[PDB]
Amino acid sequence: LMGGAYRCNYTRKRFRTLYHNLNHFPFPFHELMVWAVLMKRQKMALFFWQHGEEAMAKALVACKLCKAMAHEASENDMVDDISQELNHNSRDFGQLAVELLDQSYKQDEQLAMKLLTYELKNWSNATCLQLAVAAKHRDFIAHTCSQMLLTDMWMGRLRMRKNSGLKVILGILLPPSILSLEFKNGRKIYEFYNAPIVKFWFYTLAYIGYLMLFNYIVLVKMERWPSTQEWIVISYIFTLGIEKMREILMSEPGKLLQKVKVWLQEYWNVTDLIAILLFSVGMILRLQDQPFRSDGRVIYCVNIIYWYIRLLDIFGVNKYLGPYVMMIGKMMIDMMYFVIIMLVVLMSFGVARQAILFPNEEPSWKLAKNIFYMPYWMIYGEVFADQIDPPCQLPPCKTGAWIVPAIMACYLLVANILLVNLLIAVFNNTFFEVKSISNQVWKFQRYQLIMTFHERPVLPPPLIIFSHMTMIFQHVCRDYGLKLFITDDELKKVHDFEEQCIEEYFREKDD
Amino acid sequence: DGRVIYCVNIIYWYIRLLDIFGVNKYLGPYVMMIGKMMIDMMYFVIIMLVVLMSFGVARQAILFPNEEPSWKLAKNIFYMPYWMIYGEVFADQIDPPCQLPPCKTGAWIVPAIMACYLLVANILLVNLLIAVFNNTFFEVKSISNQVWK
Ligand SMILES: CCCCCCCC(=O)OC[C@H](COP(=O)(O)O[C@@H]1[C@H](O)[C@H](O)[C@@H](OP(=O)(O)O)[C@H](OP(=O)(O)O)[C@H]1O)OC(=O)CCCCCCC
Ligand SMILES: COCC(CCO[C@H]1CC[C@@]2(C)C(=CC[C@H]3[C@@H]4C[C@@H]5O[C@]6(CC[C@@H](C)CO6)[C@@H](C)[C@@H]5[C@@]4(C)CC[C@@H]32)C1)COC
Ligand SMILES: COCC(CCO[C@H]1CC[C@@]2(C)C(=CC[C@H]3[C@@H]4C[C@@H]5O[C@]6(CC[C@@H](C)CO6)[C@@H](C)[C@@H]5[C@@]4(C)CC[C@@H]32)C1)COC
Ligand code: NA
Ligand code: NA
């Protein structure tokens, strides 16, 4: 029910050995809570939740279990009453976890941050953040305490918080400037270059350089044999493909065919694969005779558009430039239907005009071009009334050519005054929902961004081939970032703080 | 050179009349609202510029494949794709109808990229900017009124 990474306490070899010759339980309310959750007893589970230690972890685990049971019951096509009664339990447990987190952060902040990161021995060594992410709980990760914890994990071991970013670029470009930044309590360089923010900025600078080289090679004349910049671009593409293959192989599932399915879940990955294959085909066709070389160059020119577009993924790290991109992504789906309707009207007008003006044309594929070309250009400003309805020294006028200006006028009135204004109204009246949803989704995906830049080779793709050599040499041979290991006294203090917080929460709610 | 600097200065001194206008009861808050919508517009200009640069580079590389390196290349990318979105969409200056020099290899992609670029720039981003201006106007209006008073 939990997931691939989870490992229950009963299935461990120690408990199998203990159970074979058949004691007690150190935390009985954990077992009773899981029993009540698994047997669809909501009141009993809510009673057992407020007793014992680790209330927030219990709430998140119960939420995940209820969601998984609801999904499985819906899949197994049982009575839909159960599959709708379980989702309510999941929502209730998620709300309890969110309220407990809010109370804990309201009381004390350092203990609240320590609560979300410390390793949980009873729940297969997973922190509260990982349990919340595995449960797809957006309201928990989007909370203020979770966002500040994510910012602390993203900044690395550097204490600069006023105006960052510029200093990171300075340190990347000027290594002597590194030994002037404050650090959290020789080895300073290793801690600087392993922070995820520095990795991200190094990757961004490498991508900017690669884009510049690609623009240079496509703009300037191309010869029989590739120049140096073309070789650099080809090496960048090859190493990026190798890095994508490495990301595929070291994924979460243990099956080679199954990891591909999980990797093909984000659209950026499949678009990257398509672009890399297209670039490989174009490069293969490029090193040939003149016509195939021209075809390869045209493939290069077409392919550069995608690498220009992919800068939005880089922009997505910004606080204000990410939600706008998600809003654009939703507005495209909102715009498709009006594109269809305008296409219908445009085709009608174009066919009518072409049939009226030119009545003695032999069948040719040029006819399919004259329908879409000029009616489409006529709605973006080029409404030249000399080309359409020609003034017919004087060639004879075509029969019925006085209808073309009237049809054009009606078509312009429909297309430029009605549909576009209705589209403006549609965009305007459905903006608040899209804005809130995009903000929540970006705040949730910040965690995945931080994780995927924390687990990444330090060198950018154009010279990442060297960092792939060390993974082969080390083949024959987490202090922080994910978890936080604490002693027994600190664990007891955290448990005391959590019990105080949950008691205060219940008392305040009753009052 | 001094005359050109005079022209730039007359641009600035013409702009500086909004400070004089700022004494009016209704012409001050509008200027402050302009000041904040400037930030929003500058946030959208980056995306518009990315799309524009992509289309310009693609068209320039497709149509002219035998150009020596010159700074004129950096001009042909920004000039015409920018003038296109302000109503000057042409069909003979760009995508030439190729008595006739031979057609360039792959010149049938320029009108399709042009159509997609116009659809993205003139129907999507500008309408989204209109929605952004419209849905965040009451807060800006109240704050500007308070700050002016
Ligand atoms: C070529 C770039 C293309 C990739 C662009 C990659 C995308 C990109 O642009 O980076 C975003 C990042 C901005 O975020 P950054 O951390 O630097 O600064 C934030 C900003 O100062 C806000 O004003 C702060 O408060 P608030 O929010 O107002 O309340 C916020 O504080 P907090 O809330 O965090 O505590 C700060 O985080 O960097 C820059 O743009 C600075 C110049 C660097 C870029 C200029 C140098 C090129
Ligand atoms: C008259 O002959 C000129 C000659 C000197 C020729 O040198 C050339 C060197 C390459 C260079 C600087 C030149 C023209 C286009 C320039 C491109 C414009 C691109 O714009 C950018 C624009 C913005 C970027 C995001 C994308 O690329 C560059 C990758 C690109 C760019 C700056 C690469 C550099 C190119 C001039 C004189 O010598 C005596
Ligand atoms: C140079 O000479 C060409 C010659 C071959 C000529 O064959 C012709 C056969 C009819 C055909 C395929 C041709 C041109 C217009 C084509 C129309 C375009 C229309 O578009 C569609 C567009 C979308 C639809 C919704 C509406 O109609 C078709 C009804 C229509 C359509 C596909 C019908 C088919 C027409 C070519 C070469 O032979 C050696
Ligand atoms: Na116009
Ligand atoms: Na015009």
PDB file of C-alpha atoms in Angstrom, chain B residues 48-112:
ATOM      1  CA  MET B  48       7.886  37.255 -25.726  1.00  0.00           C
ATOM      2  CA  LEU B  49      11.571  37.874 -26.507  1.00  0.00           C
ATOM      3  CA  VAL B  50      12.451  34.176 -26.216  1.00  0.00           C
ATOM      4  CA  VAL B  51       9.756  33.246 -28.740  1.00  0.00           C
ATOM      5  CA  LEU B  52      10.769  36.118 -31.039  1.00  0.00           C
ATOM      6  CA  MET B  53      14.453  35.152 -30.989  1.00  0.00           C
ATOM      7  CA  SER B  54      13.632  31.507 -31.723  1.00  0.00           C
ATOM      8  CA  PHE B  55      11.541  32.400 -34.780  1.00  0.00           C
ATOM      9  CA  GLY B  56      14.046  34.967 -36.049  1.00  0.00           C
ATOM     10  CA  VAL B  57      17.044  32.645 -35.792  1.00  0.00           C
ATOM     11  CA  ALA B  58      15.118  29.816 -37.463  1.00  0.00           C
ATOM     12  CA  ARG B  59      14.004  31.980 -40.397  1.00  0.00           C
ATOM     13  CA  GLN B  60      17.403  33.627 -40.915  1.00  0.00           C
ATOM     14  CA  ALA B  61      19.187  30.272 -40.842  1.00  0.00           C
ATOM     15  CA  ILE B  62      16.684  28.629 -43.209  1.00  0.00           C
ATOM     16  CA  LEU B  63      16.510  31.310 -45.893  1.00  0.00           C
ATOM     17  CA  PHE B  64      20.151  32.516 -46.044  1.00  0.00           C
ATOM     18  CA  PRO B  65      22.586  29.574 -45.694  1.00  0.00           C
ATOM     19  CA  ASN B  66      25.742  31.111 -47.256  1.00  0.00           C
ATOM     20  CA  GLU B  67      26.355  34.275 -45.231  1.00  0.00           C
ATOM     21  CA  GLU B  68      29.771  35.360 -44.014  1.00  0.00           C
ATOM     22  CA  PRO B  69      29.976  36.342 -40.316  1.00  0.00           C
ATOM     23  CA  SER B  70      28.976  39.982 -39.898  1.00  0.00           C
ATOM     24  CA  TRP B  71      27.174  42.135 -37.352  1.00  0.00           C
ATOM     25  CA  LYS B  72      24.305  42.498 -39.833  1.00  0.00           C
ATOM     26  CA  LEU B  73      23.324  38.966 -38.767  1.00  0.00           C
ATOM     27  CA  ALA B  74      22.560  40.185 -35.239  1.00  0.00           C
ATOM     28  CA  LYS B  75      20.192  42.787 -36.743  1.00  0.00           C
ATOM     29  CA  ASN B  76      18.102  40.528 -39.005  1.00  0.00           C
ATOM     30  CA  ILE B  77      17.045  38.403 -36.014  1.00  0.00           C
ATOM     31  CA  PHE B  78      15.412  41.119 -33.904  1.00  0.00           C
ATOM     32  CA  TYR B  79      14.229  43.584 -36.573  1.00  0.00           C
ATOM     33  CA  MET B  80      11.527  41.888 -38.640  1.00  0.00           C
ATOM     34  CA  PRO B  81      10.141  39.385 -36.082  1.00  0.00           C
ATOM     35  CA  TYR B  82       9.596  42.388 -33.808  1.00  0.00           C
ATOM     36  CA  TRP B  83       7.953  44.507 -36.503  1.00  0.00           C
ATOM     37  CA  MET B  84       5.707  41.558 -37.425  1.00  0.00           C
ATOM     38  CA  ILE B  85       3.698  41.538 -34.182  1.00  0.00           C
ATOM     39  CA  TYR B  86       2.700  45.207 -34.602  1.00  0.00           C
ATOM     40  CA  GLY B  87       0.610  44.715 -37.734  1.00  0.00           C
ATOM     41  CA  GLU B  88       3.375  44.682 -40.367  1.00  0.00           C
ATOM     42  CA  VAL B  89       2.965  41.041 -41.378  1.00  0.00           C
ATOM     43  CA  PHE B  90       4.260  40.729 -44.942  1.00  0.00           C
ATOM     44  CA  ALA B  91       4.449  37.825 -47.374  1.00  0.00           C
ATOM     45  CA  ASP B  92       6.910  38.987 -50.054  1.00  0.00           C
ATOM     46  CA  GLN B  93       9.599  40.489 -47.815  1.00  0.00           C
ATOM     47  CA  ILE B  94       9.612  37.241 -45.806  1.00  0.00           C
ATOM     48  CA  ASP B  95       9.074  33.834 -47.420  1.00  0.00           C
ATOM     49  CA  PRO B  96       9.926  35.078 -50.929  1.00  0.00           C
ATOM     50  CA  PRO B  97       7.874  33.560 -53.767  1.00  0.00           C
ATOM     51  CA  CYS B  98      10.504  31.074 -54.927  1.00  0.00           C
ATOM     52  CA  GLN B  99      12.518  34.951 -64.082  1.00  0.00           C
ATOM     53  CA  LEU B 100      12.920  33.290 -60.691  1.00  0.00           C
ATOM     54  CA  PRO B 101      16.006  32.453 -58.627  1.00  0.00           C
ATOM     55  CA  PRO B 102      15.953  28.852 -57.380  1.00  0.00           C
ATOM     56  CA  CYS B 103      14.103  28.218 -54.138  1.00  0.00           C
ATOM     57  CA  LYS B 104      16.146  27.590 -51.009  1.00  0.00           C
ATOM     58  CA  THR B 105      16.136  24.048 -49.635  1.00  0.00           C
ATOM     59  CA  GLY B 106      13.502  23.863 -46.915  1.00  0.00           C
ATOM     60  CA  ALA B 107      11.832  27.235 -47.465  1.00  0.00           C
ATOM     61  CA  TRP B 108       8.341  25.776 -46.961  1.00  0.00           C
ATOM     62  CA  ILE B 109       8.845  25.752 -43.176  1.00  0.00           C
ATOM     63  CA  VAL B 110       9.099  29.548 -42.826  1.00  0.00           C
ATOM     64  CA  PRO B 111       5.345  30.255 -43.297  1.00  0.00           C
ATOM     65  CA  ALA B 112       4.412  27.479 -40.847  1.00  0.00           C
TER      66      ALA B 112
END
